[PDB]
Amino acid sequence: GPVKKWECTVESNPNVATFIKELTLRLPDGESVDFRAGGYVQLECPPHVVEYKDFDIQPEYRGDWDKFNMWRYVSKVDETVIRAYSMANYPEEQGVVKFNIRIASPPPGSDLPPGQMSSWVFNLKPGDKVTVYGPFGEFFAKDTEAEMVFIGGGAGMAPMRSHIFDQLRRLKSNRKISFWYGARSLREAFYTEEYDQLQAENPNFQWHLALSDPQPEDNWTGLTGFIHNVLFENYLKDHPAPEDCEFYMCGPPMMNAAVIKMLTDLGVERENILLDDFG
Numbered sequence: 001g002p003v004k005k006w007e008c009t010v011e012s013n014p015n016v017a018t019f020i021k022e023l024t025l026r027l028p029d030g031e032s033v034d035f036r037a038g039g040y041v042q043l044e045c046p047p048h049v050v051e052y053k054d055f056d057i058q059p060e061y062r063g064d065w066d067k068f069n070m071w072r073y074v075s076k077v078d079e080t081v082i083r084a085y086s087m088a089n090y091p092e093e094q095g096v097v098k099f100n101i102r103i104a105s106p107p108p109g110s111d112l113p114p115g116q117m118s119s120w121v122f123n124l125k126p127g128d129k130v131t132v133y134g135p136f137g138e139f140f141a142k143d144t145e146a147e148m149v150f151i152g153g154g155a156g157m158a159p160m161r162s163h164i165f166d167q168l169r170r171l172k173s174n175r176k177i178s179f180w181y182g183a184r185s186l187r188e189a190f191y192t193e194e195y196d197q198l199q200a201e202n203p204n205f206q207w208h209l210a211l212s213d214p215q216p217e218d219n220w221t222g223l224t225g226f227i228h229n230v231l232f233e234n235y236l237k238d239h240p241a242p243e244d245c246e247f248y249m250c251g252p253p254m255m256n257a258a259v260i261k262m263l264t265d266l267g268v269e270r271e272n273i274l275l276d277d278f279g
């Protein structure tokens with residue numbers, strides 16, 4: 001049916017990585033969003049001014065905000081803006097919509113305006129009101145028996161979480177499913193307890209965190225490098241039939257491109273690769 005509108009309330013908005021927040025919105029009582037995993041809603045902001053020094057950023061992430069001179073940015077938005085954000089919750093988690101949102105600050109050293117909506121999102125405090133429209137979606141799972149390979153980075157975590165819980169918790173799928181998540185260092189990884197629990201509950205599920213720049217404090221001995229190299233060397237190189245898998249990708253643009261080239265070089269058909277392009 002037609003687009004629905006909900007006036008929601010912010011429940012929480014912590015950082016989950018240096019430049020990503022988990023925004024949770026409480027729908028007005030007695031309402032829920034009838035969405036499909038991989039789908040999204042539109043958030044709206046009114047005209048405003050936000051100053052980055054007003055943000056609540058958890059302590060461990062502040063040093064990089066200082067390093068990147070983030071606190072001096074100011075965003076002036078003179079008209080209502082609408083932007084799409086993917087649901088991080090899966091359809092059964094009701095009463096809320098949860099998001100993973102990256103702050104799109106100006107290219108460093110440029111004089112460009114800060115990202116309009118994401119700068120506003122980063123100043124949202126518990127109790128603030130946010131208008132939401134939807135549901136929408138097209139990044140949906142195929143209904144087959146094929147092995148699934150989920151590949152995420154950055155705020156592309158959100159549809160990955162929605163997809164993976166939807167398969168394992170609602171569809172109770174016995175399909176072979178793996179999730180490969182690329183991040184710079186341990187500080188940028190999140191939902192690790194959730195995926196570890198899903199792996200311990202479902203023998204058909206396996207997840208892999210790969211760090212491209214592990215920090216000294218990480219003492220990292222896990223998978224290391226960029227996710228396309230890691231996924232190839234640790235799983236797809238020896239796979240008997242990678243072209244029989246369904247690949248679901250959502251990351252930053254450079255990651256999307258590198259993973260796609262890797263896959264097609266392997267002989268995977270672009271029709272077996274589904275990309276959520278945040279744009």
Ligand SMILES: Cc1cc2nc3c(=O)[nH]c(=O)nc-3n(C[C@H](O)[C@H](O)[C@H](O)COP(=O)(O)OP(=O)(O)OC[C@H]3O[C@@H](n4cnc5c(N)ncnc54)[C@H](O)[C@@H]3O)c2cc1C
Binds near residue numbers: 105106
């Ligand atoms: C279906 C869909 C789902 C999405 N899901 C998510 C999600 O789950 N999480 C998420 O974080 N994002 C998601 N996105 C992206 C999101 O909708 C926004 O595009 C993103 O948040 C940036 O919007 P913004 O208004 O903050 O920045 P914008 O105002 O659109 O600015 C974007 C960037 O451009 C820079 N810029 C400004 N002016 C210029 C200029 N003249 N030249 C060059 N650069 C300039 C800004 O400083 C900023 O870095 C999704 C998008 C789609 C379409």
Ligand SMILES: N#Cc1ccc(Cn2cnc3ccccc32)cc1
Binds near residue numbers: 153
């Ligand atoms: N948002 C975000 C985000 C940005 C970079 C990385 C590091 N990373 C890992 N694999 C990569 C492939 C190509 C390019 C970068 C890559 C991870 C997440």
Ligand SMILES: [Mg+2]
Binds near residue numbers: 125
């Ligand atoms: Mg306020």
